Each structure stands twice: as structure tokens, then as C-alpha cells.
Design a protein around this ligand. Sequence first.
Ligand SMILES: Nc1ncnc2c1ncn2[C@@H]1O[C@H](COP(=O)(O)OP(=O)(O)NP(=O)(O)O)[C@@H](O)[C@H]1O
Ligand SMILES: Nc1ncnc2c1ncn2[C@@H]1O[C@H](COP(=O)(O)OP(=O)(O)NP(=O)(O)O)[C@@H](O)[C@H]1O
Ligand SMILES: [Cl-]
Ligand SMILES: [Cl-]
Ligand SMILES: [K+]
Ligand SMILES: [K+]
Ligand SMILES: [Mg+2]
Ligand SMILES: [Mg+2]
Ligand code: NA
Ligand code: NA
Lengths: 384, 384
Amino acid sequence: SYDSSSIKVLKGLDAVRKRPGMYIGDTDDGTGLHHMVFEVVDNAIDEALAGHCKEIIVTIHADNSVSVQDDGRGIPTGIHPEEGVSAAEVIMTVLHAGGKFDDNSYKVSGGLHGVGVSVVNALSQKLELVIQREGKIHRQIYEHGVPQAPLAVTGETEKTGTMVRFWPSLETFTNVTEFEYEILAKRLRELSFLNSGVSIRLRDKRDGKEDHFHYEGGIKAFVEYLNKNKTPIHPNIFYFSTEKDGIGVEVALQWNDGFQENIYCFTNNIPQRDGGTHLAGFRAAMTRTLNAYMDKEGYSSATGDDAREGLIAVVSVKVPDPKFSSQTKDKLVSSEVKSAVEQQMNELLAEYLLENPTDAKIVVGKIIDAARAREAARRAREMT
Amino acid sequence: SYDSSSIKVLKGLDAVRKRPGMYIGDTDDGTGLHHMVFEVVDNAIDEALAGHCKEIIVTIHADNSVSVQDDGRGIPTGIHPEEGVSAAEVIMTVLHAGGKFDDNSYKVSGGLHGVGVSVVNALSQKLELVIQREGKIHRQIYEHGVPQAPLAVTGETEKTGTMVRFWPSLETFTNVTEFEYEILAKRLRELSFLNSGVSIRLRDKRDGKEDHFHYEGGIKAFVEYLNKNKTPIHPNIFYFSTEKDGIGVEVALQWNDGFQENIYCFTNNIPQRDGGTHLAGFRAAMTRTLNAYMDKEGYSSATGDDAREGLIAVVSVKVPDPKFSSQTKDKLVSSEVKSAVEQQMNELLAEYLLENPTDAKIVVGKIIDAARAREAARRAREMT
Ligand SMILES: Nc1ncnc2c1ncn2[C@@H]1O[C@H](COP(=O)(O)OP(=O)(O)NP(=O)(O)O)[C@@H](O)[C@H]1O
Ligand SMILES: Nc1ncnc2c1ncn2[C@@H]1O[C@H](COP(=O)(O)OP(=O)(O)NP(=O)(O)O)[C@@H](O)[C@H]1O
Ligand SMILES: [Cl-]
Ligand SMILES: [Cl-]
Ligand SMILES: [K+]
Ligand SMILES: [K+]
Ligand SMILES: [Mg+2]
Ligand SMILES: [Mg+2]
Ligand code: NA
Ligand code: NA
């Protein structure tokens, strides 16, 4: 019988355990598992974006838990008047709850849904929260998202910060159940390039391995690092950072003598593996600007794909309220970011080409060469 | 000051309006807008999967609203004891609320999150709900997700069904704000192929256009339709439907003399544009099975990509609890579906090749040809 009794409302964090795919992604291949860490790291990076955190420590513990310590402002501890429990507990236990729904606590933040750490909490067999704030140390333990006692003061400190340690639930995660140093290291290295002046440490207590990421030079250096085992064909990396019409657009790029295209897109320091409106705007401006230059200089027909070949590019945007298609934020679905990136690229790339004639002539040569190889491949196919 | 007062909990449907990207996708390019219709249609298709709905009517109204009428069981109308309002209102107003969290009301359903129609309601300036059930007509109106009065009985009927008409909010949707007949028609045509015996009608009150989709022949016919303006190279479409280990796997495919690959994947009748574990399993089985056949018959080196060229395939799986990465369900993230598709394909495709030697020899020829064209393209590139 299909009737009112058949309709069920999931409460608290039950929806997260029931439908983990829409909150954490794939619970079998390891991507969801490492995403648990990235949610916690993203919250610390948001304190760094806000100007309050200068050191982040990620530790893989020997019992297969992970901790993230930050020296930010600390998760608020006072009783939330509407909810009747510490703000920290609200945050850990309530979906669509947080401090990122306006721009008062974080001007710009990767976080926006009020969901991330509460998902981590929901899918962890245990979670330990330690908060240093207003002279005091606060502690609380959760099991499968259920707080064991209310947040309590345990001592004094001159410091501020948040430490979250979590033990993932094997009732949720299957197959890849251990953390992979290199997966975490890739992301943290990236975050160092994206956050100059923030010390990011990674420690593996299983084997004693550690890294300290504090790169100089931001996304321009990131482009160098990425071309390190390749052969750049021109010496001057194109770079700019602007803030126009409420949107930050930062781009670095350089061509190498290979044939792959590697464009890394980020929104508020969160990578979009599946691209989005920022990537679309970058592509459109690149195609237009190179075409105009080749027309004006009398080198002209090469398409957007020919420009792509040998390209390494980083596109980092800063947006007050971006729009992602999912909690995992693999794709940016914000049309106004396409226009901002496209506009800034069109203006500044055209200027780069004019100020750097040697590089410009090399890049044109490369585009023409890619076009020549494409047409030869096509002729060869047709003839078989 | 960042403190407990800075932490906000979004209630009811406020989170949906605040962060529409994670619920509906892109609110500017039209995809989110049409997805509003698809959520409502999916709920009717679920009544059809359950065996209770035989006719679905989709109408685009002249005032830019859309209605979906189904002749299913009807959304439950009785007071929900826990929530204190009609089950219908719970459904329309509460996230993670519905009848698809077990398999008692729907054995198999595209719906699983308890979110879809409540998102439609949240992002509509107005929504009209009419429910025919247990001898009675029930009606309710919402504005921006707020019910105007409680669900009320308005008359009598011998029929059963649900009608939802919604007017999308222009406070959410921008730029593409009108419905496109062809976008709806593509999906409904697909759904007719996927649901043999279900009459699906589409009517546009703006211009009088209509369609009635009731295709014979299921996904095998779907493959024909897709190859209609192309040139199939072998006459016998490979087809099977099995249900093993709790999973339905249904596949049809055929090669044409073109060079594109078009694999259409579905889970509980919902398309995955971004593929997933079903697509991964299909690819893996195809590659293995063709290779083994070419080895055994002495035709052997061609890769998975060469097999892909000229392929049209439909892969339709039926799963008790699938896992998607998002509310829009663009990607299936369920590892056990990869194994089920891979296993069934390996067994049944090998049998197809043995029972259809003429087709098998043609397909081998095509693979070898694709391989030859690929190597010639590569040589041609290298030489420029
Ligand atoms: N390390 C931290 N330091 C200070 N405040 C924090 C920290 N981690 C979490 N918070 C607070 O907890 C809130 C909720 O976090 P979370 O559940 O991850 O959602 P969110 O960051 O707001 N958005 P999202 O991650 O996109 O779902 C944040 O908005 C902050 O106000
Ligand atoms: N046309 C319909 N006929 C009968 N019951 C329906 C119909 N539409 C919705 N329902 C009921 O309303 C519930 C909630 O629908 P909805 O909010 O779309 O979530 P869902 O279908 O369960 N899952 P999802 O669409 O993946 O978020 C369903 O689970 C059904 O129990
Ligand atoms: Cl009822
Ligand atoms: Cl506080
Ligand atoms: K939260
Ligand atoms: K609902
Ligand atoms: Mg967060
Ligand atoms: Mg639904
Ligand atoms: Na914000
Ligand atoms: Na179910």
C-alpha cells in the first residue's frame, strides 16, 4: 500500500549515510575517501583566504585516521541561541549550516554549501574536534556523527585554531580504505602555490615521511613546476592578476614542445576537474586573441584545438558567490565568471603578445605547426 | 567578529534558493530550467517503472509554465503523523523526504534522494498540485515553495494520478527563460524507447505542436532510430536483457560506417551524460571480448578506442540503490554496476559473435580499419 506511511523524512545526518554519492562521490575507488580530507583542508584554507591562518598541518596517523590542524580563528564555541547547542556542534551536525552564506566572516571562500565538514562527521566512525579560542581549549567527540558529550572547555591557551581528526566509517567506504600520501601531497602542493605565505605541512606517521610546502611565486611558479620535466618553447610566462567587477581573475600560462593540453582551473582555491564557465571563458579569449594577432601580423585556418597543444595554464578565479553543480565542486556553473575571464584574458593576452614579440612569434609558429600536423593526420586517415 | 551569531542554519527550502547550482545545475544556460521538467517527469516515469502509470502528458503552456500529468497511483494525501501535514505537502516542502528510501513503494526508481520535486517547488514562483486518489480530487497551490492553504479535496473522480504545473522563478533563472520543445521532445522520445507500453505525449500550447511517443521495440529500436540517418555496416543488432545478482542489464548496439562513438548510458531510466561505472564496465567488456575473438579466430594491436569508432550503443541498468555524484545524476558512481555490466557483456557478446559470423567478420574488419587509420594519422603527425 502506497500512502502517507510510505513517506519518510531523513533527519540529522541520516541522508548523508543513506545517499553518500551526492555528498562525497565514489565510496569505493578512494576518491570519496580522500575527499573527506579535502573538505577539512578547504575549511582551513578558507581561514587562510580570510587572512587569519598561516600554518596548516595535515597528518596521516598510523591507525588510518587523518588530522588537520590550522592556526585560524577557531570554530565558534558559544551556544547558538536558535539551535540551543554550541555553534561548533550545529556546524558538525546540521546540513546547510555555516558562516559562509554572507561575506562577513569570509569575504571569499571555497566553502559555500554549509555541508562539507558535517558530511565528514556523518561518514566517520569517530571524529575529534579541538578548538583553541578566546583563551580556552575546547574538545568534543563524535561517533557516526553523534556527539558524545557537549563541547567542553579542557584548559587554557594563548593560541587560536581548529583541529579535526576523523576515522572514516567502513560501513560507508569500501575497497580503497587507506590514505595515499601522494594524493594528499598533490593537492597540498597545489594549495601552497595558490596560497603564497601559508605554510602547509604533511606528515605520515606510518613511515615518517613528511613535506613542507611553502612555495615562492604563486601560480607563475606553479606553471614552472608543471613544465619542469617538459621543454618550454618560450621564456616568458604570461601572467596577470586583476580584480574587476567583483571578480578576481588570475592566470598564468606557457607553451611547451609537447602535444598535450593541461589547463588547471580553480574557484576560490578549489579545483574543477570537470572545468566549467571559467575554462569556457579562457578558451574563448585565447582563440579570439591569438586569431586577431595572427590576422593583424599577417600570419593567417587554425582552430581553438591548435592553440591548446603544448599549453600549460592555470586559471584561478575569486568569486563572492560561485555556483557548483555538486558538493564535490568538480564543475563551475557560473555564467558571469565566463565573461570576467574572457574579458580579462582578451585584454591582457593581447598586451602580452605586443610586449613580448619573440615569445609571440614562437607561439604563432607552434600554432601553425599544430594546424599542419592536424591536417596531415586528417589526410592520412581519409586515405586508408 | 566571527562567533556563534555568524553561524546560520538554512531552513525549509531556503538552501535550494541560496545554492541552486548543487540542486538544479546551471540557472543561466537553460539546462537547469529544463531539468525542472525532467524532475517532474522522472517521478511519473517511476510510477510507470512500478507498473501503475501507462500515460504521461507533458504540456508547455502559453504563459511559460509546464505541466506533467500522469495516470499513476497519486501522491499520498493523508496527514503525515510525524510532520502533522499532508504527505503531499511534506514531499513538496521537505528535502530528503519521499517514498524511495526503501523498495516497498518503488522496487526500482530513478528517484532516490527525496529532493527532486521539492527543488522544483522551491525554484518556482508558483506550483499547482492536483492529485486524484481514493475517489477524490485534491488540490494545493504553492508560491516560492510556500503552501497557500493546506491540501484540500475539491471533488470526485474514478481516476488516479498526479498533475504538477509549475511557473519557474526568474529570481533564479536568467537568460534562457523559455522552454524549448526539442529539448523536452528528445528526452521524452528516449523515455518511450526505454518504457515500452507507456504512452508519452508532448503538447505545446504556444503553437499547437504535438507528439505522441509510443515506440515499439525498446532499446533495440532505439539503436535503429539512432542509426536511421547513418549507414549500419552489419544487419544484426546485438541485444540482451538479463537480471542477475539484483541488477538489470540491458544492452543494444550496432556499428555504422562513420567514425563517431555514441554510447548512451542510463540508470533506472535516467541518462548519465558524464557516464560512470556502467560505461566503464561496457568499455572493458567490449575491449576484452573483441580481443579474445580476434585472437581465437586468428585476426590478431587494436585498442579500446578502435572498437569505439562507428559504434552506437545503449546501456540501460536497473539498480535497487544506485549512487550518483549529484542531484542531476550526470554520473553513476556505483562500483558493483561496473562488474554486473562487464560480466553480462563478456558472456553475451561472445555468444553473439559466435552465432552471427557474418556480422562478426564485418566488425573485425571495421576494428582493423580503425586501427590502420589511427596508425596512419600518427605517422603523418610525426612527419610534419
Ligand atoms: N577550520 C575552521 N576554522 C573556522 N571555522 C570553521 C572551520 N571549519 C569549519 N568552520 C565553520 O564551519 C562552517 C561549516 O563548515 P562546512 O560544513 O564545511 O560548510 P561550509 O565550509 O560553510 N561550506 P561547504 O564546505 O561548501 O559545504 C563554516 O562555514 C565555518 O563557519
Ligand atoms: N507523480 C508522482 N506519483 C506518485 N508519487 C509521487 C509522484 N511524484 C512524487 N511522488 C512522491 O514524492 C516523493 C518525493 O519526490 P522527490 O522530492 O522528487 O524525491 P524522490 O523521487 O524520492 N527522489 P529524487 O527525485 O532523486 O530526489 C517520491 O519519492 C514519491 O513518493
Ligand atoms: Cl495517504
Ligand atoms: Cl562564539
Ligand atoms: K555544516
Ligand atoms: K522531497
Ligand atoms: Mg566547508
Ligand atoms: Mg524524484
Ligand atoms: Na559567502
Ligand atoms: Na529505493
